[PDB]
Amino acid sequence: KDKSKELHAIKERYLRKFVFEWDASEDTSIDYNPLYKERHQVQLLGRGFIAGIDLKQQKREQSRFYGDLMEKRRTLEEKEQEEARLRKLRKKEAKQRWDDRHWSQKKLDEMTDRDWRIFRED
Amino acid sequence: MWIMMRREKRDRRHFKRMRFPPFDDEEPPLDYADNILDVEPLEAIQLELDPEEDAPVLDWFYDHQPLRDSRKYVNGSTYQRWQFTLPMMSTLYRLANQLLTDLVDDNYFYLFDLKAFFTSKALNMAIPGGPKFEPLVRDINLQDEDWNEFNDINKIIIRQPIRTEYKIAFPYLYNNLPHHVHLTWYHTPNVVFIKTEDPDLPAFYFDPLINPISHRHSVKSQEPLPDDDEEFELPEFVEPFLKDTPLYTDNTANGIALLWAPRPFNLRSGRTRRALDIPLVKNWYREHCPAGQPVKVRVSYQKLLKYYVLNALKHRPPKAQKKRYLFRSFKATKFFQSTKLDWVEVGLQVCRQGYNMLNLLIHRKNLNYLHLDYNFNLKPVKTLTTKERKKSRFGNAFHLCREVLRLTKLVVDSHVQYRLGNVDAFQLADGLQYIFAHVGQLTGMYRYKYKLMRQIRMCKDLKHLIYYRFNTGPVGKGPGCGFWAAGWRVWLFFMRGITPLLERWLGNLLARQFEGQRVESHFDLELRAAVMHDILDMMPEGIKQNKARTILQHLSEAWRCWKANIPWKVPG
Amino acid sequence: MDFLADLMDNSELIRNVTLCGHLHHGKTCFVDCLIEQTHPEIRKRYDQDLCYTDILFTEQERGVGIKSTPVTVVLPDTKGKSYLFNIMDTPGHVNFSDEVTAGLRISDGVVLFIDAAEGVMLNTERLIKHAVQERLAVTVCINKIDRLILELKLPPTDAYYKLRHIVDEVNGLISMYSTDENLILSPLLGNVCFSSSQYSICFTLGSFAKIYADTFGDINYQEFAKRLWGDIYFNPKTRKFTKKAPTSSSQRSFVEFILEPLYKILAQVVGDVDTSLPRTLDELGIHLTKEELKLNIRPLLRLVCKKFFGEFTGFVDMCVQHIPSPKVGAKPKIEHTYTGGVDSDLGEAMSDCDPDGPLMCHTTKMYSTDDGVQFHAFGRVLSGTIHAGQPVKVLGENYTLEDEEDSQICTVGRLWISVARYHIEVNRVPAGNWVLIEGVDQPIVKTATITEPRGNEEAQIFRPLKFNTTSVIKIAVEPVNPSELPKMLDGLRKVNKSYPSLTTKVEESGEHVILGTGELYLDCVMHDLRKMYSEIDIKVADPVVTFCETVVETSSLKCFAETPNKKNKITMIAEPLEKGLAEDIENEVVQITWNRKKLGEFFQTKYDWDLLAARSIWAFGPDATGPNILVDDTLPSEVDKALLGSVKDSIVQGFQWGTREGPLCDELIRNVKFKILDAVVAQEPLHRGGGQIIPTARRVVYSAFLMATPRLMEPYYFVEVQAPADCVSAVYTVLARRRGHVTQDAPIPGSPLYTIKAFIPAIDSFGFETDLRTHTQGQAFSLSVFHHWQIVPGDPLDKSIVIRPLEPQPAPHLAREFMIKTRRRKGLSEDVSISK
RNA sequence: AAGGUAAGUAU
RNA sequence: ACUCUGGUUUCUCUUCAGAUCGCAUAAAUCUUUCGCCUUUUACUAAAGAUUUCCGUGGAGAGGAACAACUCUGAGUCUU
Numbered sequence A: 001k002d003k004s005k006e007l008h009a010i011k012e013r014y015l016r017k018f019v020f021e022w023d024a025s026e027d028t029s030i031d032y033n034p035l036y037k038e039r040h041q042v043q044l045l046g047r048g049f050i051a052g053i054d055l056k057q058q059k060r061e062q063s064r065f066y067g068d069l070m071e072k073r074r075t076l077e078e079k080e081q082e083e084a085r086l087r088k089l090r091k092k093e094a095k096q097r098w099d100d101r102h103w104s105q106k107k108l109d110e111m112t113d114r115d116w117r118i119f120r121e122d
Numbered sequence B: 001m002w003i004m005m006r007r008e009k010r011d012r013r014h015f016k017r018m019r020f021p022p023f024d025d026e027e028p029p030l031d032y033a034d035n036i037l038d039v040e041p042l043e044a045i046q047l048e049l050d051p052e053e054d055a056p057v058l059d060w061f062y063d064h065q066p067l068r069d070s071r072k073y074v075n076g077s078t079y080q081r082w083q084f085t086l087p088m089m090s091t092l093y094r095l096a097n098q099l100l101t102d103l104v105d106d107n108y109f110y111l112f113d114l115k116a117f118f119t120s121k122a123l124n125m126a127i128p129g130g131p132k133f134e135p136l137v138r139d140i141n142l143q144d145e146d147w148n149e150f151n152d153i154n155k156i157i158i159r160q161p162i163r164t165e166y167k168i169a170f171p172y173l174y175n176n177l178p179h180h181v182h183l184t185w186y187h188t189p190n191v192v193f194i195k196t197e198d199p200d201l202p203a204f205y206f207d208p209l210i211n212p213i214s215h216r217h218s219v220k221s222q223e224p225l226p227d228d229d230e231e232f233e234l235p236e237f238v239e240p241f242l243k244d245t246p247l248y249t250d251n252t253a254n255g256i257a258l259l260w261a262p263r264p265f266n267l268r269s270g271r272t273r274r275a276l277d278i279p280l281v282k283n284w285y286r287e288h289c290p291a292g293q294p295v296k297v298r299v300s301y302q303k304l305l306k307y308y309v310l311n312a313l314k315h316r317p318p319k320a321q322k323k324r325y326l327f328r329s330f331k332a333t334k335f336f337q338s339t340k341l342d343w344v345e346v347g348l349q350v351c352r353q354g355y356n357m358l359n360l361l362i363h364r365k366n367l368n369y370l371h372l373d374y375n376f377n378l379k380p381v382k383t384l385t386t387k388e389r390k391k392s393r394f395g396n397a398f399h400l401c402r403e404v405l406r407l408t409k410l411v412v413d414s415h416v417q418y419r420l421g422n423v424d425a426f427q428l429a430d431g432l433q434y435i436f437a438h439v440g441q442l443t444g445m446y447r448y449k450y451k452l453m454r455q456i457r458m459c460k461d462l463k464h465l466i467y468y469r470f471n472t473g474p475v476g477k478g479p480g481c482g483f484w485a486a487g488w489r490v491w492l493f494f495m496r497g498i499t500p501l502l503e504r505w506l507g508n509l510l511a512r513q514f515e516g517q518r519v520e521s522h523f524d525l526e527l528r529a530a531v532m533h534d535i536l537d538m539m540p541e542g543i544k545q546n547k548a549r550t551i552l553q554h555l556s557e558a559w560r561c562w563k564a565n566i567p568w569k570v571p572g
Numbered sequence C: 001m002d003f004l005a006d007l008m009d010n011s012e013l014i015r016n017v018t019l020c021g022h023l024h025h026g027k028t029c030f031v032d033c034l035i036e037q038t039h040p041e042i043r044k045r046y047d048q049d050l051c052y053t054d055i056l057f058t059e060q061e062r063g064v065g066i067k068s069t070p071v072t073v074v075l076p077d078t079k080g081k082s083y084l085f086n087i088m089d090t091p092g093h094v095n096f097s098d099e100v101t102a103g104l105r106i107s108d109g110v111v112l113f114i115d116a117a118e119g120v121m122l123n124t125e126r127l128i129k130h131a132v133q134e135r136l137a138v139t140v141c142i143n144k145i146d147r148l149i150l151e152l153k154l155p156p157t158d159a160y161y162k163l164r165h166i167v168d169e170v171n172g173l174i175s176m177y178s179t180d181e182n183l184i185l186s187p188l189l190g191n192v193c194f195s196s197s198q199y200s201i202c203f204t205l206g207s208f209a210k211i212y213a214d215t216f217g218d219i220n221y222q223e224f225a226k227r228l229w230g231d232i233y234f235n236p237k238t239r240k241f242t243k244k245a246p247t248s249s250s251q252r253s254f255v256e257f258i259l260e261p262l263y264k265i266l267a268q269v270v271g272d273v274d275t276s277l278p279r280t281l282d283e284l285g286i287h288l289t290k291e292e293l294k295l296n297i298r299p300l301l302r303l304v305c306k307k308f309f310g311e312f313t314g315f316v317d318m319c320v321q322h323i324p325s326p327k328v329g330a331k332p333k334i335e336h337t338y339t340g341g342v343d344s345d346l347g348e349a350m351s352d353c354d355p356d357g358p359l360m361c362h363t364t365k366m367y368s369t370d371d372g373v374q375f376h377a378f379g380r381v382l383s384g385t386i387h388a389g390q391p392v393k394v395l396g397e398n399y400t401l402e403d404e405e406d407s408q409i410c411t412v413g414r415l416w417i418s419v420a421r422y423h424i425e426v427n428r429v430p431a432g433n434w435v436l437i438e439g440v441d442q443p444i445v446k447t448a449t450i451t452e453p454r455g456n457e458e459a460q461i462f463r464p465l466k467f468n469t470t471s472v473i474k475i476a477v478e479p480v481n482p483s484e485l486p487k488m489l490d491g492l493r494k495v496n497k498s499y500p501s502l503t504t505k506v507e508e509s510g511e512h513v514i515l516g517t518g519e520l521y522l523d524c525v526m527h528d529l530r531k532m533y534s535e536i537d538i539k540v541a542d543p544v545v546t547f548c549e550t551v552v553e554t555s556s557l558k559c560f561a562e563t564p565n566k567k568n569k570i571t572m573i574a575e576p577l578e579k580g581l582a583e584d585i586e587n588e589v590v591q592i593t594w595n596r597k598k599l600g601e602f603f604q605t606k607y608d609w610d611l612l613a614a615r616s617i618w619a620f621g622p623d624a625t626g627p628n629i630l631v632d633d634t635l636p637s638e639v640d641k642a643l644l645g646s647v648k649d650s651i652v653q654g655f656q657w658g659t660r661e662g663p664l665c666d667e668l669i670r671n672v673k674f675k676i677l678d679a680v681v682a683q684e685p686l687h688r689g690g691g692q693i694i695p696t697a698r699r700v701v702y703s704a705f706l707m708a709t710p711r712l713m714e715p716y717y718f719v720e721v722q723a724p725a726d727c728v729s730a731v732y733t734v735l736a737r738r739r740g741h742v743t744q745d746a747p748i749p750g751s752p753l754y755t756i757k758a759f760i761p762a763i764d765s766f767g768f769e770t771d772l773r774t775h776t777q778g779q780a781f782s783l784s785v786f787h788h789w790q791i792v793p794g795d796p797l798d799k800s801i802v803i804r805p806l807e808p809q810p811a812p813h814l815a816r817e818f819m820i821k822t823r824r825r826k827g828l829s830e831d832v833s834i835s836k
Numbered sequence D: 001a002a003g004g005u006a007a008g009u010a011u
Numbered sequence E: 001a002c003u004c005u006g007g008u009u010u011c012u013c014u015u016c017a018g019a020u021c022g023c024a025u026a027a028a029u030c031u032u033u034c035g036c037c038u039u040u041u042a043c044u045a046a047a048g049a050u051u052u053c054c055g056u057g058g059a060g061a062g063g064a065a066c067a068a069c070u071c072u073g074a075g076u077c078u079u
């Protein structure tokens, strides 16, 4: 199918009602070239992230190429510092998740005002 | 706010979206003397700033017009020309990492920048991720040229098809007639910036990302160096220039990372902007659409890019003016007074005043069979007869004013509901976002202005840009997103344009004095009038007025004699 | 102002340098810094760069240097000796390498700009090789030092390691091209300078030692600079420089005294403006006003580095010491450039660079005016002075002492000394300078020699400009309205005058083909043609590459051709050449003008040709250094050698013409050796005329080449890409898609970027740069240069192969297709007429 | 938003 | 190491605006090309020229906070 798409592109080159929605036919991001369809997203050295999208999900969608490169090039001494930083950040985020958890994981006596109003609003 | 709202949507699995309209149609607007004045507000959306890291900005981060009275950072009460220090700029830059893409150079915008889109519009094609436009010049006859010996396909070697991007990267080489075309920046050098991931590490560090230099000793590097430690000796007062100064402070890494920062965060000082003039999500659709996204959000991306390109292209420098200021000449006259009021109180006052004005306009001809409720819905008080239905007609301008006052009433009522305590601050933000994303559904003001649809389709588009950035992680779809800046500014930009129309329609309506195929039937009538006026002016008509009509008769017959192709020679 | 004019008389106080380097390495920004230093009223804006030499509208929009720009300015030295510098700001893009050569011929010195982060790149290697070929002095400037500090955040020891690796790699590159040992580089020798033109930093070891000696006093800045690089350490216990580290972690002299203060000043400026910057500026003696501390980080850093470092005296002293003046640097230039050699009387006079000698200019550039209707020649005066409004004799590339046809007398109008944006009108320009000559544009096409009329009649021309790479991209250009055909031709003429490597040729069918090096080069050429020269609508055909023709087998039968006089018979055979021999001819390793005894010894040694057979070599084709060799192998007892030598010249011209116009698709012929096996020449002198032999020689060449197995040759470009380590796989995928194979993928030492070097078909390289940058989302960038001709797969004479229009043919169908369409583009017949 | 007013006598 | 050097903020008025007035972006009218066409009032969407509107900079002027000392450079700046 896609092989005939290239030839069709070559041939084509040479030879009342209110619509709140935008029609899907208006889409321009349609390509036959595999290079222009599955583009290589910017890794940003494994330390940059696209705006808006949450960092936690972006970390698990990473290509892991730079993570493997770091764990390969790093010596033991500099590996320990990164391991300690990762452990500290993991513990901080674990504490944050423990404090910010659903009311199903808390007893009635230990409920806070925010969790109380969350339960009431349900 | 973006960080906080995703926290209050991820945890709040079921979100109570506000009910619109907040108040009943017949309920009069709430008085600001027994309902909101005495009640205390609920908590607002405010992130818990860390006392250790976010110390420079902790004191004033959530204050209205921060640091206005600090003469060191802001010029004064006029709130212009902020001067900031590097620690605060770096702290602010970290608190905005969610809204900023970590792009170091504009090589990302290779053929996806403004010049490339101008080229594509001029050349009638379109970048895949870019917008589509009506052709600059039709040239349909010249679009399909004949099978010349020059463009002969039998003489053309095809290896890789010439894409739209190729005809944009080198516009003057790949297509004929490259008119009104723009040349894009070829290649900014790859800014190889390596941002630190741990503060507990020297600012100047050989990061593992750098490929090791690996100074080779295979060839013994030989260079002319004099006989060691025998002839040259430094004086005792000679030391490296800055030996007391440390190599790096705590702010060295953050100061370096501030250099490779987006436009607002790479400045030490600057000028104060309006909240309207700050597009927070402008760079979200300026970049490429994230992969793995549905069709509608992609089309939203191309349409937002289309509107951005059209604005940037059809832009003319502002015209010189004498700077006459409104709200300055009001208080010059003895008709206006100045005070300070809570914004909710002013909103209620303006809603009531707009209701009074629309009520005055409705009972213009002493017709009392049209009733305007407090939600700004116009309905007959009874089954009105056909003559009365005709007699109670208002133009599109009146209904447009009614619908804009309805939108203001919706906004003020949402804020009033928040102030009373009915809805949360997060609920208020989500309600404002819904109001500004669904103005067509809420008010239906597009029926009286179809061009307004351009705003409406944009407000939905922005939603697709925001929602799919918002509901991305553990947070799923739901009525919890409250990033209402984009729709709010869009409707303000509509407002600045529509204000003159409503102002001139009103001022010429409720004033004491009212004011209200000609191309082809133009020159003949004007010519006859001019000739007759000249002849009658030179005529000594004190005795020969009765010839005047006769004169026109000649002006007919001669014309007829020309139209009949017959001789015309009056002897007398 | 007047001192600048009075400084031209002394040829010793003039330096003719050209700033060459890879694309976007800071040459233009460095010239901007020099201009700002010399011109008080010219300062860059805080956000936008200055780009003083980027005068074209294309340059200010593309952001890439297109044309070389002359900048004549007076620069103080370290001591204060105000020298006169003629800087040629050359484009860094490889496609415009020819634009460098135009500025490289009239320059006595080369300043190689190297990015600190990127290091040595493709165009850098090409430029050092080429400059060494023209026997020019080479000095290196590592620009963008701040990228090691503000971008990589390397430790000062690692920054020194990166700088040492950069300098040592150029030393290992010059050794591959220069036999002279004086071409070595070292910052302590004064050869290597360090700079960051974005922040106006410019220091050598001598300049920074001079700053130290000004700060503390009683220091020999020359002796101090002699110990400010390498493994030499500083011991403060003895206050002495020791080859062994005084302590365990003693930093080197360069790291401790040079890189450490620069790192600390940049760190204070970019991180501690409010806290420690005033203190460190009082420590450094720099006083900045309250408003000058209100500027953003980058303008403040540029200002503070302007105050601390002051003038660009390190660049000046490097150029003065290691780049010869025209007076002393004329002799190698005359030897390598003048056709008559240094032994000639005119050559001997020009070797002295006498301002009172006979006039001898050498125009290498041609700059258009505002309206584009008049061109100003630009060249170096080598002997005598040129006066405004003076009749002179303008030669041409085809002029010889025997043929005064190519020389036209023209009156020199106003003369300008050209400095980027503006030009200062002058009356006379003494020898050793650069001059914009007005009024001599008409006889000049590409390169000409200007001398005086009615005197110095024994004046040959300078050698024609020799370019680094061959131009193979070909585009056919027609007017949209045929009624406007002459204007396009007129415009064509103008671009031929404005681009040194441009080649405009009218074909048999009437198509006008333009030859260029790459996509950007031809894009700029068409922009110039459409917008300023022709000002008419233009139709451009799809880009195509030029092909060559070769053989892979010996001709099956002896091919004979007889003249229309029916008295002369030539029987010839065709054989392919050995590997590298054609390249040796192209590289001018061996010339036909060599002494014949050693000329045969070359082929007897490196290729083991028979001494008698090697001595039988007649000439090379189609040019003097063309890759085709014509060898005689007639039986001595069967053909009279003396009689055969009578028509030897005619056979040589026939061979050259036949090799220049191939039979397959009317293209060049490469890597073919034609052996003359039988000659039967009419004994009468008038029956062996050239008008009959030359067409017959071409016919027999065609027959022998056709009987030998023909093959088409397509150009292969050498592409190096610098991309993040993650993007290597994407580059591999793109290259594999475009019939290209990767030869190497090496990490750049001192930077995460990897450089991937590959070979791609030239006809498959159209859009390859766009494909790579778009697929990698701009992270990968490529520069393409022609590398070598390679046999395209498939039999080109296969008549059975059917070609489908609008389909990319498979590999075995390429060689055939590449012929037929090319023939259709030339107006030739449908197939190769072997019987013809 | 409209192009959807029956007109006529009588107070 | 010295004497004089006279502020900054803010409220108004009058003008000039090249410059991203604006690191943001509306509306109206007119003229052409279109898409709906069925009549204006609304429109489809590109272009050109205008007008209005939301804002802006510079300069000058007039009041107020300011209360002024002195910042600051000018210099003989002093051992």
Ligand SMILES: O=P(O)(O)O[C@H]1[C@@H](OP(=O)(O)O)[C@@H](OP(=O)(O)O)[C@@H](OP(=O)(O)O)[C@@H](OP(=O)(O)O)[C@H]1OP(=O)(O)O
Pocket (backbone or CB within 6 Å): A021, B296, B437, B460, B463, B467, B471, B477, B478, B479, B480
């Ligand atoms: O799926 P759709 O029917 O297209 O609904 C989408 C979208 O929902 P999806 O996320 O499922 O695309 C939004 O809802 P969320 O699920 O993102 O919360 C949004 O809803 P709100 O703006 O009201 O939150 C709005 O739905 P609607 O406007 O119908 O309520 C929008 O509709 P469109 O994409 O069709 O404009």
